[PDB]
Paper text:
A nearly closed substrate-binding pocket between domains I and II was found in the unliganded CbpD crystal structure, which is suitable for accommodating a monosaccharide. For CbpC and CbpD, no interaction was detected for all of the tested carbohydrate substrates in both ITC and NMR experiments, suggesting that transporters C and D are not responsible for glucose or cellodextrin transport.
To gain insight into the structural mechanism of the transporter specificities, 11 crystal structures, both alone and in complex with appropriate saccharides, were solved for all 5 putative sugar-binding proteins, thus providing detailed specific interactions between the proteins and the corresponding saccharides. Combined genetic, biophysical, and structural studies have provided solid evidence that transporter A and transporter B are the major glucose and cellodextrin transporters, respectively, among the five potential sugar transporters in C. thermocellum.
Residue numbers in the entry: 58 to 368
The structure:
């Protein structure tokens, strides 16, 4: 990912003059994944604009190879004493990280939260990100259920056990499917955000459920794997697949018909607006406490537009 989408705000006020000429921001996010590359695009755009105004923003971009709730706490505690003006967090475990945030705030360092979900019950100054993973799950599930004519069998790739946004999307899937009583959810399995596991899960489902009619995929990786397995079995377009996020393989699968709908989030503004609001916070200025970046459903007719803008 090198650009943004049409979701990004075109009317965001950046006229405020920062009360310093230099700022240092430590970013710590749940785990390495291509998804975060789309946020980093917004960060790098804000730093450029602020460099033209004689303002130098330096930042570190840290995430572990695999998610580790304690590592995230440790990353916050250790950054406190390293001379950062603000700590930006994409959250692993809200309760554990909340307390780590409060410790950083108590010791004089403001904290921003960004990305997939907010920690509203902690002393973070502001949030920029998706305020509604449940709704994203509902959007995908409604689209797939309606495309299936409100009847048939759906299987659910459910991602990583206990991951907040995965679990909220999954709750949205099920609450929505419940509104179509002629649809049966035959199974749900945890791919753990691994493409190969999503492939193997889907392969098993194609054997076990000859009548499978739809698959819902709650993270950026599992639509890739569902589409690959469905295409390899010759079932592209005959099983209705809906998934999260913007992997180029998923967006290309929209064009070829294997994927029906992708739910793309405004990752760019998560990073772009994080920087500008961080500065207002470091300076003591007020800023919107919760900025919702938004998301939208992308079908085949919008695939090329999103591919071109993101890649």
């Amino acid at each position: 990912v090198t650009g943004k989408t049409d979701l990004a705000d075109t009317n965001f006020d950046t006229s405020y003059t920062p009360k310093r000429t230099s700022y240092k921001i430590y970013c710590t996010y749940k785990n390495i994944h291509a998804w975060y590359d789309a946020i980093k695009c917004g960060i790098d755009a804000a730093v450029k604009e602020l460099a033209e105004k004689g303002v130098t923003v330096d930042y570190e971009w840290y995430g572990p190879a695999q998610p580790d709730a304690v590592d995230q706490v440790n990353s916050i505690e250790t950054a406190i004493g390293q001379g950062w003006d603000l700590i930006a967090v994409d959250v692993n475990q809200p309760e554990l990280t909340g307390e780590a945030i409060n410790n950083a705030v108590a010791k004089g360092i403001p904290v921003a939260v960004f990305g997939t979900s907010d920690v509203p019950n902690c002393d973070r100054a502001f949030f920029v990100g998706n305020t509604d993973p449940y709704g994203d799950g509902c959007a995908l599930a409604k689209a797939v259920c309606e495309k299936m004519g409100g009847k048939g069998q759906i299987a659910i790739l459910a991602g990583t056990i206990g991951a907040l946004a995965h679990e909220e999307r999954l709750r949205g899937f099920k609450d929505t499917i419940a509104k179509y009583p002629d649809i049966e959810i035959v199974d749900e399995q945890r791919d753990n955000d691994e493409v190969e596991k999503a492939i193997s899960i889907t392969e098993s489902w194609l054997q076990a459920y000859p009548n499978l009619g739809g698959i819902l995929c709650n993270n950026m990786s599992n639509p890739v794997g569902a589409c690959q397995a469905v295409a390899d079995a010759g079932k592209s377009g005959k099983i209705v697949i809906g998934g999260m996020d913007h992997d180029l393989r998923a967006l290309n699968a929209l064009k070829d018909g294997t994927l029906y709908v992708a739910q793309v989030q405004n990752c760019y503004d998560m990073g772009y607006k994080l920087i500008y609001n961080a500065i207002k916070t470091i300076d003591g200025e007020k800023v919107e406490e919760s900025t919702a970046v938004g998301s939208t459903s992308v079908y085949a007719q919008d695939a090329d537009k999103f591919i071109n803008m993101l890649y």
